[PDB]
Amino acid sequence: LPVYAPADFIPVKGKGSRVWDQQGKEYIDFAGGIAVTALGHCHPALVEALKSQGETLWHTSRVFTNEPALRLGRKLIDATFAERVLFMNSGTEANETAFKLARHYACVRHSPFKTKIIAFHNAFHGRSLFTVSVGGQPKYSDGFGPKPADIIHVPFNDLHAVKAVMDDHTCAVVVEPIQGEGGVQAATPEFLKGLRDLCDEHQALLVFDEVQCGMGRTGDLFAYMHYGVTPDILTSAKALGGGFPVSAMLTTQEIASAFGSTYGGNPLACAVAGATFDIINTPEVLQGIHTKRQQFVQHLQAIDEQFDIFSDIRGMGLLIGAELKPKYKGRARDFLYAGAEAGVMVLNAGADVMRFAPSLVVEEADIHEGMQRFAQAVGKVVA
Amino acid sequence: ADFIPVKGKGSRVWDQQGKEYIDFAGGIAVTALGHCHPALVEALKSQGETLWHTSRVFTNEPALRLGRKLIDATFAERVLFMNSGTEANETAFKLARHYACVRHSPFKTKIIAFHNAFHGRSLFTVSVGGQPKYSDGFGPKPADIIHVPFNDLHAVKAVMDDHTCAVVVEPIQGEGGVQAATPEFLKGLRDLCDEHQALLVFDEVQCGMGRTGDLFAYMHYGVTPDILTSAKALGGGFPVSAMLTTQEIASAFGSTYGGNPLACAVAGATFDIINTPEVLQGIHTKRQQFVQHLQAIDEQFDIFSDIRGMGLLIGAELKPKYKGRARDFLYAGAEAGVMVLNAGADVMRFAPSLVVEEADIHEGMQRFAQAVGKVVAL
Ligand SMILES: Cc1ncc(COP(=O)(O)O)c(/C=N/OCC[C@H](N)C(=O)O)c1O
Ligand SMILES: Cc1ncc(COP(=O)(O)O)c(/C=N/OCC[C@H](N)C(=O)O)c1O
Ligand code: NA
Ligand code: NA
């Protein structure tokens, strides 16, 4: 079942980690619009970037570059393995470009028959026909007519299964370093390094979808940096624009040459993403993400001590998953709705897992107040 | 291109050296109210202080208001918002497929589309697009897409059957040489879709939101599609898009779905201006100003075989002597200080602001005449 807000919960205003609806009810936001508003609502630096670029230039076509795109590209190139950056609007679009690029690179550099894409059960990569087919939930890709072929799914974290299906006809392995929608499941170190080794062996490209786990979410700028495994292609969105739709596909010159250092990028979007990048990619903010994770986790542990609802607390940085015990299997939506009644916005990650993806700069006072509200909601659900 | 735009106001653009250009390209028919239009800047700033983002779990006031405006003004009863034309087309094509699957048969999957069509660059949309060069080389394409020539109603009749789920068409093919559907072709598509229980999908990403001098091209033609997509002009430069359909069709998936609050506030302001008698009338006045200049340029330099399009989507096809050289005129245009487009290597394309000042039409077309003069003087 999808989760939709009823007619009496329409957000009208946000500031920091607080949201107000049409009736003026105030909520603490631990959801971030699904890990998008990584610097909270109407952050003054992002508002300033939006307004100043908004007076100057909003739009160029892909025929032109613009100063905000150039500056953002340079920032991303300097901070990561990337040598080339392509900007788009959404994570779905960035993933489309990544997957097409892996396919095309294989086609032109090796063979038109080198087409297999390996992906993982419960993966989420977007809702376009190609991306949802690479995604690992057949319920979401069924019912749209013929899917793009040569996509093979195996279980996340099953390196043996990857080894078994990979071959010289394989062009890519596509993986979320942490599967956000798929129960907040993190890759193990041996699995992710194994993917890098298998891609090297088969001359396939390793594609990291960091749309959800990138741009500071894990407490490193990108999850790949936490793991110390470098992909061939990486995608980023959501937190990248802090609520403004923007995305990026990062790769090397060698790979991008199959298709300056940057291509595309809406001037307004890139100005906002530049401001977001400048704040997130700091020692102070990245350290604070770790401090804040532990504040949330301690609250979740306290709730569990009182109410006995969780079997596991997991995730990385400020992507937090809390798996419900068997006695509460399927109840994630109910805790989410009770949370909203109590004035706190949370997420699910499937029907058995609570998910939290607050602003990376969420104030300690908001953590405590929001988690008190969530405790109150838990009390109502399990009374 | 050989310059970097840094600032725009209306239909004038400045580069890093402060060189002033006249913009007849609109970032490819996107900045339909020109650069930094004060109403759009005001909407951006006001919503930008209030709320930028909601997930698809929620709606928001700008999305509800924009949905209402589009529903009241068009055949639509339901509106789904996305970021780009590509995303809106993905949603439209998936919806046509899914509707056929659940309302008729899982085997009802054929999509009919047209040679030279452009629908976006995602794997699915580029495969529905009609330029094999752009869909080749990405591995297995989504199947059950058949292409026939644009404007060939006989060919559509021949390929359509009970296993057909959709006909996808741009009422005017912008990228494909600025070719307009004939009335009998477009009406014919509606009749064949009715006969075969298929959905007629109009891609109005380029020709919609006032571009033709009607709010949507379907209104010009008087042929109502089942699904329509809109983007580009809809946000005036802010990335936003919409898929418009009926309740009966949308139910295969309240009245709106999705929509970025900031994007929808900007698009609401854009909609309010474009959907006015005066702006829509002006589009026709201005088209004739452009066309008169193109005619005078042809009288002096003898370079065009045809001037076509609708409203402020203008195509000027080059004579056989200049075939393949549209890029040469585009570059000479830029040197002369005017930003124009191509529509393939044989066609010049113009897609200026719908409110482009007459002074800018005359100045930009004088610069374009200079560019043409330079190219022809050899
Ligand atoms: C790992 C990962 N990859 C790709 C995407 C798609 O990015 P988007 O198009 O920017 O939403 C996402 C986006 N998730 O957003 C929640 C889902 C969304 N509400 C939807 O179903 O479209 C993601 O988490
Ligand atoms: C009829 C029609 N349908 C869909 C699209 C795609 O819209 P977009 O994703 O908003 O660019 C377009 C976009 N055209 O943009 C011009 C070319 C484009 N920038 C490219 O190179 O992909 C269109 O004209
Ligand atoms: Na680098
Ligand atoms: Na209507």
GROMACS .gro file of N, CA and C in nm, chain B residues 51-56 58-64 66 79-83 240-241 256-265:
model
   93
  434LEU      N    1   0.804   2.742   0.120
  434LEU     CA    2   0.815   2.596   0.115
  434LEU      C    3   0.859   2.560  -0.025
  435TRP      N    4   0.969   2.485  -0.039
  435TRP     CA    5   1.017   2.445  -0.171
  435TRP      C    6   0.970   2.309  -0.211
  436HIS      N    7   0.968   2.217  -0.114
  436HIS     CA    8   0.964   2.076  -0.147
  436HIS      C    9   0.863   2.000  -0.068
  437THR      N   10   0.788   1.913  -0.136
  437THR     CA   11   0.712   1.807  -0.070
  437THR      C   12   0.737   1.681  -0.150
  438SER      N   13   0.734   1.566  -0.085
  438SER     CA   14   0.740   1.439  -0.157
  438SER      C   15   0.603   1.409  -0.217
  439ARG      N   16   0.598   1.304  -0.298
  439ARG     CA   17   0.472   1.265  -0.362
  439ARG      C   18   0.368   1.209  -0.265
  441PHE      N   19   0.255   1.387  -0.034
  441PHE     CA   20   0.176   1.506  -0.004
  441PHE      C   21   0.140   1.581  -0.130
  442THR      N   22   0.040   1.667  -0.118
  442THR     CA   23   0.020   1.773  -0.216
  442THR      C   24   0.064   1.905  -0.152
  443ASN      N   25   0.041   2.016  -0.221
  443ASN     CA   26   0.080   2.145  -0.167
  443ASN      C   27  -0.004   2.249  -0.239
  444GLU      N   28  -0.012   2.370  -0.184
  444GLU     CA   29  -0.103   2.469  -0.240
  444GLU      C   30  -0.068   2.511  -0.382
  445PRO      N   31   0.062   2.532  -0.413
  445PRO     CA   32   0.091   2.567  -0.553
  445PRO      C   33   0.051   2.457  -0.653
  446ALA      N   34   0.073   2.331  -0.617
  446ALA     CA   35   0.036   2.220  -0.707
  446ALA      C   36  -0.116   2.211  -0.724
  447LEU      N   37  -0.191   2.227  -0.615
  447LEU     CA   38  -0.336   2.225  -0.622
  447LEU      C   39  -0.388   2.338  -0.710
  449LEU      N   40  -0.220   2.506  -0.948
  449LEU     CA   41  -0.182   2.484  -1.087
  449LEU      C   42  -0.267   2.373  -1.151
  462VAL      N   43  -0.420   1.572  -1.320
  462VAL     CA   44  -0.289   1.623  -1.359
  462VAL      C   45  -0.184   1.561  -1.269
  463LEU      N   46  -0.082   1.504  -1.333
  463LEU     CA   47   0.036   1.453  -1.264
  463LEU      C   48   0.153   1.543  -1.299
  464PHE      N   49   0.224   1.592  -1.197
  464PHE     CA   50   0.338   1.679  -1.222
  464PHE      C   51   0.471   1.607  -1.206
  465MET      N   52   0.565   1.642  -1.292
  465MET     CA   53   0.701   1.589  -1.285
  465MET      C   54   0.799   1.705  -1.303
  466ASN      N   55   0.925   1.674  -1.334
  466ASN     CA   56   1.025   1.781  -1.351
  466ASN      C   57   1.049   1.817  -1.495
  623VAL      N   58   0.979   2.191  -1.475
  623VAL     CA   59   0.849   2.140  -1.430
  623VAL      C   60   0.780   2.081  -1.551
  624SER      N   61   0.696   1.981  -1.529
  624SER     CA   62   0.619   1.923  -1.638
  624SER      C   63   0.489   1.866  -1.587
  639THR      N   64  -0.482   1.603  -0.838
  639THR     CA   65  -0.342   1.626  -0.879
  639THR      C   66  -0.251   1.523  -0.814
  640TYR      N   67  -0.135   1.500  -0.874
  640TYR     CA   68  -0.038   1.411  -0.813
  640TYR      C   69   0.099   1.470  -0.831
  641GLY      N   70   0.174   1.475  -0.721
  641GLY     CA   71   0.308   1.532  -0.724
  641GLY      C   72   0.306   1.682  -0.744
  642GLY      N   73   0.421   1.736  -0.783
  642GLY     CA   74   0.437   1.878  -0.806
  642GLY      C   75   0.522   1.941  -0.698
  643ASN      N   76   0.639   1.990  -0.740
  643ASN     CA   77   0.730   2.062  -0.652
  643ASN      C   78   0.665   2.197  -0.621
  644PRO      N   79   0.652   2.234  -0.492
  644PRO     CA   80   0.585   2.362  -0.458
  644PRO      C   81   0.645   2.484  -0.528
  645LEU      N   82   0.777   2.493  -0.531
  645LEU     CA   83   0.844   2.604  -0.594
  645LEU      C   84   0.816   2.604  -0.745
  646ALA      N   85   0.831   2.487  -0.807
  646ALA     CA   86   0.809   2.474  -0.951
  646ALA      C   87   0.665   2.513  -0.982
  647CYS      N   88   0.572   2.463  -0.902
  647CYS     CA   89   0.431   2.488  -0.931
  647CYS      C   90   0.391   2.632  -0.907
  648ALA      N   91   0.455   2.700  -0.812
  648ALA     CA   92   0.427   2.842  -0.792
  648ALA      C   93   0.470   2.922  -0.915
   0.00000   0.00000   0.00000
